[PDB]
Amino acid sequence: SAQNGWQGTGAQATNHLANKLAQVLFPAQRSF
Amino acid sequence: SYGEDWGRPLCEDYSGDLFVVQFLSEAVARGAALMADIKYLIRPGAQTDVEHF
Amino acid sequence: YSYVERTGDGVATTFNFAFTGKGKGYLLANQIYVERWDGASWQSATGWSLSGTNQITFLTPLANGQVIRIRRIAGKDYPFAQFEPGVMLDMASLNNTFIHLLEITQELLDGFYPDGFYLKQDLNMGWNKIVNLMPGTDGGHAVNKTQLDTLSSHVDDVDQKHTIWNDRQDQQ
Amino acid sequence: QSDTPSIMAESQFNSLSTKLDAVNLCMRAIGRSGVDNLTSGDLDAEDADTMIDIVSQRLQYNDGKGWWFNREPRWSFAPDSNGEVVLPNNTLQVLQAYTLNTRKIDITIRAGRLYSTTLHSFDVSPLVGPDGFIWLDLMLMLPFEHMPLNVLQAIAYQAAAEFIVSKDADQTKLQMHMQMAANLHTGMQVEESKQNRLNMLVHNPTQRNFGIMAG
């Protein structure tokens, strides 16, 4: 499955953190 | 860690906090669902009849 | 009624029983009998002691799956009390005697028969079945349907091997 | 060696279980001693016998449902080809079974065999369940025997108070029995829910349905 269960804060928080680290650490527009 | 063949994730340090949040969230949700339900009541010897009511 | 069976499965050392009747069920402490089933015949257990109102304590824990039962044995020859001139009439004795005369009946009512017992006369059950009987061992022992099924199947076996034996000869 | 078997083998508790002892207990607090035989020739002896029988189903019924020993789950009757089904022995009340995909149909108990008001036919052939033997829930009446030891004490004291007020008129004796018997009833009713325990969730259909979803 992929249910969040009772609480969904953790999934959203970890998605945001992983995505923001991916964006900052490897900027898409410019060379890293 | 030293002498370790595999790393450790960040969620390891706060799985406890995540579990606590889950517990409180399920408590709140279950309480809200319980309060949402209505049950209705009538006093014995009511001198009134539900069938016509 | 009179008998209580208990199957011990490890660790447990205290077993309880319940004889029929008001209060305890047995008049005297000597009336309790403990028997153990060894898988072939009921033997008399040893080492048991009375450590409760109806709970007995064994010296060692019983093996898993061991089956024992508890019986109440009452005197079958003499009345419990005798009344004689010049003595206070004792209701305690009077009550005990009636229980004694009853407690022997439940013994007989539950089929508990003394050793060396055989009825001297022909008995008929008036069109009633006999159930739950394993195959007999001695020639003088009765046989049930299972043995009859075994013999009937064997007759079918000799019948069918006759058919295979006689048929392939028929081609010559 | 040792003395545990020797000393306490003589010990006697003599708990009360016979119907006569309840009558003898009911025959106290009133004067005369109890009767030795249930039948006897004393008028008050059978008068106490009547009280025990009457107060039996009154107490066993509580308000609505009785205790756990009066529970009788799903039955099957399969009414005969002759007609309606006859209710077994004496039943305090009859309720419909509540399984899934079972529409609500009226069941009412007349003398023995039941009656359906909506059909108005004293025989009930058509309202039989699909391949089901009209599953329903009912409540037998156990005799004075075949009951726990505590309920025997509860019924005796309650009957004793009713006998005293009918027989005698004394405030002190009556007040104690009514108060003390009510103490035992609550002290016994408390464990009824404690036995066969049930909780908010699972049992409540809407709570279990909410529990399965979003989880």
Is the CB of residue D55 less than 8 Å from the CB of residue D159? yes
Residues of chain D with a CB closer than 8 angstroms to some CB in chain C: 2, 4-5, 8-15, 17-18
Contact D14 C50 (CB under 8 A): no
Is the CB of residue D59 less than 8 Å from the CB of residue D155? yes
Is the CB of residue D156 less than 8 Å from the CB of residue D188? no
Chain B interface includes A3 (CB < 8 A): no
Contact A9 B26 (CB under 8 A): no
Size of interface A-D (CB pairs under 8 A): 4
CA diameter of chain D: 79
Chain B interface includes D208 (CB < 8 A): no
Chains C and D touch (3+ CB pairs under 8 A): yes
The chains in contact with chain A, meaning 3 or more Cβ pairs closer than 8 Å, are B, D
| Residues of chain C with C-beta less than 8 angstroms from the C-beta of D14 | 22-23
Is the CB of residue C72 less than 8 Å from the CB of residue C107? yes
D43 contacts: CB under 8 Å, gap ≥ 6: none
CB atoms inside a 10 Å sphere around CB D154: 20
Identity of the amino acid at D40? S
- The token pair at D116 is 């359906």
Is the CB of residue D181 less than 8 Å from the CB of residue B8? no
| Residues of chain D with C-beta less than 8 angstroms from the C-beta of B37 | 206-207
CB atoms inside a 10 Å sphere around CB D81: 5
Name the residue among D85, D65, D61, D62 with its Cα closest to residue D75.
D85
DSSP character at residue B10: T
Question: Residue C23 burial by CB count (10 A; 0-12/13-18/19+): exposed, middle or buried?
Answer: middle
Q: Given B11, B21, B26, which is nearest A9 (Cβ)? A: B21
The chains in contact with chain B, meaning 3 or more Cβ pairs closer than 8 Å, are A, D
Contact C53 D11 (CB under 8 A): yes
Question: Residue D212 burial by CB count (10 A; 0-12/13-18/19+): exposed, middle or buried?
Answer: exposed
What is the C-alpha to C-alpha distance for residues D20 and D16, in angstroms, rounded to an integer?
9
Resolution reading in Å: 4.0
CB atoms inside a 10 Å sphere around CB C80: 18
Q: Given B29, B30, B37, which is nearest D206 (Cβ)? A: B37
Name the residue among C23, C118, C12, C109 with its Cα closest to residue C65.
C12
- Give me the residues paired with residue C34 across strands: C70
The DSSP secondary structure of C93-105, one letter per residue, reads HHHHHHHHHHHHH
What is the C-alpha to C-alpha distance for residues C53 and D13, in angstroms, rounded to an integer?
9
Identity of the amino acid at C27? L
D51 contacts: CB under 8 Å, gap ≥ 6: D26, D159, D162, D163
Closest alpha carbon within chain A to D215: A5
- Structure-determination technique: cryo-EM
Is the CB of residue B29 less than 8 Å from the CB of residue D214? yes
Chains B and C touch (3+ CB pairs under 8 A): no
Chain B interface includes A5 (CB < 8 A): yes
What is the C-alpha to C-alpha distance for residues D162 and D104, in angstroms, rounded to an integer?
41
Strand segments (E) across D132-195: 136-140
CA D70 to chain centre: 5
Residues of chain A with a CB closer than 8 angstroms to some CB in chain D: 3, 5-6
Per DSSP, the three-state class of D93 is strand
CA C92 to chain centre: 32
Name the residue among C143, C56, B37, C53 with its Cα closest to residue D201.
B37
